[PDB]
């Protein structure tokens, strides 16, 4: 009955709740009641889309309050108690869940994580030591899997070693994949669905292991919190291709078998689509190395910053596609009466002598797309007859499209990303560290502990001490910031 | 070896040939070191240095691009390598008048993918003698995707990276150019070289005594003049 | 046995040493003790890679202190004596 009053009252109440002083006075667990408010406000800023800025700002101030409240500690064991309170680092996992960025890029927490990571130089020594482990990972994994004792069993269990082992396994996968196309192991093309080659055998275990790992991960997540990471989506679509390849290759194995020449095969022969799908799967499989570089220090931030500029390009390829559609729909009308195809050896633009480009809608779309990179020669816009007026109007439209889509629209893409880079680059490390920490925490458990090739009262006292720690932290914070920093503001009338 | 045998009929790896090639590369590097002479100028110096600084902002990028290139080459080789034609052609590869058989070997595929950047690879490469008009389409699709990624989405980001870094660097231009020029000068102040390469073939207690007085004067002037005088120039507070 | 305390203590001590006032009071050769601290902090900002910003900033302030200490001269021969001393 009163929209304005209701909305304003809601905003006032929420701003009242999210104030450091009030939180410090009347609250049980500052950290939780900060996370909860941050999440609730952030999500609520979506359903209401007029006061967006205020809600975003409030979430941000909650984030910074939580970070600064964490900062006031002066004891390692203090910190570990804070991060452990609820099998290890449960609260930090909670923070990761709540997308609480600034709380995790804290130098003390980072030292703790690093110390628990390395578990005990210079780049030459690190290089030789790193490369050494790959040349021996299989027997090491064997030692764990057969004799989980404190001779070699613990050595893999150390995280950094586990990461090195998995990297080495993945490099082996790519090497075998790349070796798949050698004529030394490709005995003969002319055969309908021959039995899998040797390399085709060695690949299969890696496919099985990857499938099982993704099954475990999706069992944990269940399409929720799993699909969001675009890398997982890529993994899903990239696994499906391999599965389809196996199934279809079996189909071809059982239907057809003969020594018929490669040239005289009809389209949609199962082996052909099998090869094509396998190749696309190879591209996606190889393309996932970039995700390995978040663990480096020189490339990490750069990789993330490239990661952020995709909603700044996808919102643009759409407009360009719309323009392309309009112009193709135009140029088809003018020409489609001149479909020549009078006994030519080939047809289309994908030929040595380009001809008959502007005939069909699909062909026109192809020509318009390739025109961007200057791979379409000019004499296309020409007809066998001498109607030297349409030949001019067609060239005019083609030129107009080139101007619009290569001098007026692309430069605006450049001038867009350019401005966005400064909006993003300011927040580079604060986010890179969060990504790297997530990557690390993926390894700290006894969950995977195996490369994919070889994949087949109690708390009253804790509350007692935790409350004392909380009291000390909140006392230090209240005394040291909301009092001490107030007496540092400029004068007024 | 010593004979008057025609140039055309020499086998590969003939020593004279590699000698000429190595000599030429040496000529390129030898000639390329003139840029270092221009730090002694005043109009070009700062500019030369600023170009000098933007190399860790590009080498950290060519790496990513090389990775993408490797992935796509490894892809396109699988689709095609069954169609290695080489049926009595006069030449072979892309480095020929009529491009043919580009996507056959891994090395050849790498060459084609690299040259594709500058638009020197004609389109009819992705075509086979037979009429399997499905693979001919998937190959073209991958080729187009590579071109989009590596010429409209990745290079513009190189531009937008160096652009932002230039303002981080340009602010400190002269303060660094002068240091470089001074090093260049101090390379000459001694009686060490004194010849062009063609024609190349108590004592200190008193000093301490005066130096200490100079130090005392300087530190007195500094303490009086900055850490005192500039303190009484700060804005008010609560 | 105490990583946090040790690191923070190291940082506090190094920030204490690199202050223009303290250098001017108790030091023999300001110029050297400035160069040495600059180099030591700059290189130390590499082995420790969490407090990098503080160490870089400290090295920078040492640099600017050295420059400004040089600046306060009003005699050519004064300058030449300063630059020649070994
Ligand atoms: C820049 C105009 C130069 C005039 C050149 C000319 O007369 O040729 C007509 C050109 C096309 O050239 P032709 O079709 O070969 O005549 O039309 C345009 O591209 C206009 C661009 C429209 C851009 C909005
Ligand atoms: C911009 C899309 C225009 C559609 C044109 C078209 O249908 O042709 C398919 C094109 C390639 O053209 P052809 O292989 O000749 O069909 O595929 C892409 O390049 C997609 C780019 C993928 C970029 C991520
Ligand atoms: O990311 C995937 C997804 N996987 C699949 C699944 N199915 N198909 C695939 O091609 C791939 Cl890569 C399993 C392998 N890794 C790599 C992991 C270990 C090595 C790394 F740290 F570098 C990056 C993470
Ligand atoms: O820099 C070289 C390295 N040299 C070599 C050594 N071996 N091979 C070479 O081609 C070169 Cl240039 C010797 C010549 N200079 C040039 C110096 C004098 C002239 C200059 F002030 F312009 C720049 C410095
Ligand atoms: Ca995954």
Residue numbers in the entry:
A (entry chain B): 187 to 272, 284 to 317, 324 to 659, 696 to 732
B (entry chain A): 459 to 659, 696 to 732
C (entry chain A): 187 to 272
How is this structure described in the published paper?
Here we report five cryo-EM structures of TRPC4 in its apo form and in complex with the inhibitors GFB-8438, GFB-9289, and GFB-8749, as well as CaM. Within the TRPC1/4/5 sub-group, TRPC4 and TRPC5 share the highest sequence identity of 70%. Both proteins can form homo-tetrameric channels that allow the passage of Ca2+, but also Na+ ions to a lesser extent. The architecture is typical for the canonical TRP channel family with a transmembrane region (TM domain) where the pore region of one protomer domain-swaps with the voltage-sensor-like (VSL) domain of another. The cytosolic domain harboring the ankyrin repeat (AR) embraces the coiled coil helix in the center and the N-terminal ankyrin domain is associated with the TM domain via a helical linker domain.
Similar to the GFB-8438 and GFB-9289 inhibitor-bound structure, an extra density was observed inside the VSL domain region of GFB-8749-bound TRPC4. The structure of GFB-8749 shares a common scaffold with GFB-8438 and GFB-9289, consisting of three six-membered rings. A cyclohexyl group and a pyridazinone ring at opposing ends are connected by a central 1,4-disubstituted piperazinone ring. The main difference between GFB-8749 and the other compounds is in the terminal cyclohexyl ring with a substitution of a difluoro group at the para position. Thus, the interaction of the protein residues with the pyridazinone ring and 1,4-disubstituted piperazinone ring are found to be almost identical with that of GFB-8438 and GFB-9289. The terminal cyclohexyl ring substituted with the difluoro group is stabilized by the hydrogen bond interaction with Y646 of the TRP helix and the cyclohexyl ring is stabilized by hydrophobic interaction with L495 of helix S4 and Y373 of helix S1. Interestingly, we have observed that the inhibitors GFB-8438 and GFB-8749, which have lower IC50 values than GFB-9289, interact with both the TRP helix and the VSL domain, whereas GFB-9289 exclusively interacts with the VSL domain. Similar to the apo structure, the channel is closed at the lower gate in all structures of the inhibitor-bound TRPC4. In the ligand-bound structures a characteristic lipid density is situated close to the pore which is either phosphatidic acid or ceramide-1-phosphate, its structural analogue.
